[PDB]
Write a protein that binds this ligand. Structure first.
Ligand SMILES: Nc1ncnc2c1ncn2[C@@H]1O[C@H](COP(=O)(O)OP(=O)(O)OP(=O)(O)OP(=O)(O)O)[C@@H](O)[C@H]1O
Ligand SMILES: Nc1ncnc2c1ncn2[C@@H]1O[C@H](COP(=O)(O)OP(=O)(O)OP(=O)(O)OP(=O)(O)O)[C@@H](O)[C@H]1O
Ligand SMILES: [Cs+]
Ligand SMILES: [Cs+]
Lengths: 328, 328
């Protein structure tokens, strides 16, 4: 079949944003495609991470990946750093990418605020993501909207290398969902829901408890009209909450706009909290099962084994094309 | 004993400049220290290289490394790309280095002329060189003068990581020779002798033949005084040629200034050509022996094996300190 690749950084617990925009579709896709799902830890470190917490977020993400229904026998789930080829590839691509191309990446100008001194791994994030993808001769990359641009740079780098050193890489394509590709922060509806938001009220994580979900939802930035209708420019808050409600419940923005008429925010929120609560209930229960057993580690071992064979073969080929090392 | 590390890029055939400033001292040091000598191929690719030529320069450098007297049983000689840990380390260090620190590297502002678009591997060269070094718990780095700054950045990165994530790395020290640390181009005595000089007349390679050496020496940029005396600012050409003559022959600048009095350039050069010719004669003969046998490959296999055990153990430790992957 066709091959898909997608990664999720172990920089916090994944949010209902990471779930709706990417992970949720992983559970279906793993049956239609040859899928590689990665815990991108080498990306996580482009920005400070407490060591103990990175270790634990890596193992939690793995458990959630499984908990939401990824089948270790249908998809290969693995940790990037456990596969050296990602760093080997990343360096070879860093050599054909242009500083100007890196400097212009949106995620880099954003993440690099006027902030005094930035780590180069923030500039060089993109070639590593290109490796992640190109290593597996990837066809489709199922990601939320924010990663689109990085994927285009991935494509340019594949084509650059192919015409510079001969056909080797497959030219991947992004696959952003038509709905819920950019879930916004509950605290500022102009910013995306980001799991590394300094303000925990910005996101709801897949591991948040009922009480906590009820508060973040309650606290969510709405407006004054007490009118439950969809408007992205007028009521960016209420719009966002509508989507989450839609995508998560099954109902359209309309059947929800209807259901909440002469009805106000207070109730609309307490219901959204229960929708999100119920959605995460089965997930969280399976999550606990995976966290208390050595089974998760076995999964990951076999996942790296499999990624190592495919990717290490691609590095050999790339080396052969560029003339690195010796004839093997 | 103490550990030394030094690398030589496979970007051309090494010059009498690379020989006088670094390689020559390798032959003695390998007995006093625990030495790792590397064919830095991943560095070579920060700038375009024809694949076939890179492959062949990698194997030639290996042969010269041996030919000049490096003893595979006293020093570990190996190819960087054959050891994944160099790229793994390089990425972890790219994450603690600062763009501003890279941007200010001398070799990067030079190599990055006003040139329209530069490859990021030219900005990121330094973290890879830091890995090369730090991976082996390196004490001394025997290099020519130009690499000094890169070594200081290496030191800052070691100290940065040690205080950020705990003591792990040894703080290396440079070891530049007092004599012949900056052999200059035969064609422009303001520029260093660089083996990737577009103008072949700029350098004499360890593989140049008698005829060729005789021309490059003859062509060498002198002056008008026809006076064989040492002056770095006045006669930068003649000064340089004096050094090469000194360091290579054994005689001081003085015994040479003396020997050439009422004597002119024409003869002083034809003699220098024979000094350089005779110096390279044994080297070149041993070089041919190493190029026509599978013995060179065995050397390199055992060299990578040995580098892989030491470096892979260091990556494990660095990962453990930063919290990457899982507990191993
Ligand atoms: N708000 C979002 N809505 C829908 N999809 C999203 C949203 N944010 C990210 N994704 C998609 O989730 C996947 C995992 O992303 P990632 O690997 O964590 O990288 P990111 O940088 O874009 O993620 P976060 O913002 O949540 O985390 P941090 O960077 O703060 O650590 C991707 O496929 C992504 O597009
Ligand atoms: N002109 C020189 N005189 C004395 N020593 C020199 C001179 N140039 C370099 N070295 C020392 O040689 C070693 C090998 O250097 P390298 O690994 O090739 O890197 P480089 O970039 O400084 O070397 P070249 O200039 O000759 O090659 P290219 O970059 O053009 O490919 C180092 O220990 C170095 O200092
Ligand atoms: Cs499948
Ligand atoms: Cs030794």
């Amino acid at each position: 079949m066709k091959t898909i690749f997608s990664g999720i950084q172990p920089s916090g617990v994944i949010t209902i944003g990471n779930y709706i925009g990417a992970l949720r579709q992983f559970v279906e896709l793993q049956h239609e495609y040859n899928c590689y799902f990665c815990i991108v830890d080498q990306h996580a470190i482009t920005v400070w991470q407490d060591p103990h917490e990175l270790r634990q977020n890596i193992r939690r993400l793995a458990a959630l990946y499984l908990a939401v229904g990824i089948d270790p026998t249908q998809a290969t789930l693995f940790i990037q750093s456990e596969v050296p080829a990602h760093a080997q590839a990343a360096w070879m691509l860093q050599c054909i990418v242009y500083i100007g191309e890196l400097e212009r990446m949106t995620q880099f100008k954003e993440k690099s605020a006027g902030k005094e001194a930035v780590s180069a791994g923030l500039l060089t994030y993109p070639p590593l993501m290109a490796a992640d993808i190109l290593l597996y001769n990837t066809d489709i990359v199922p990601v939320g909207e924010d990663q689109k641009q990085h994927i285009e740079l991935t494509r340019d780098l594949a084509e650059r290398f192919n015409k510079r050193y001969g056909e080797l890489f497959t030219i991947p394509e992004a696959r952003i969902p038509k709905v819920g590709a950019r879930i916004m922060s509950l605290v500022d509806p102009t910013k995306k829901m980001s799991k590394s938001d300094p303000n925990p009220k910005a996101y709801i994580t897949l591991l948040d408890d009922a009480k906590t979900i009820e508060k973040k939802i309650k606290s969510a930035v709405t407006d004054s009209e007490g009118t439950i209708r969809y408007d992205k420019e007028a009521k960016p808050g209420i719009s966002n909450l509508l989507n989450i409600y839609s995508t998560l419940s099954g109902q359209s923005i309309e059947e929800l706009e209807r259901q909440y008429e002469g009805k106000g925010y207070g109730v609309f929120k307490a219901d959204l909290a229960q929708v999100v609560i119920e959605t995460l209930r089965p997930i969280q229960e399976r999550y606990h099962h995976w966290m208390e057993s050595e089974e998760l580690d076995r999964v990951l071992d076999e996942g790296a084994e499999k990624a190592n064979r495919v990717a290490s073969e691609m590095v050999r080929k790339m080396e052969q094309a560029m003339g690195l090392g010796r004839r093997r």
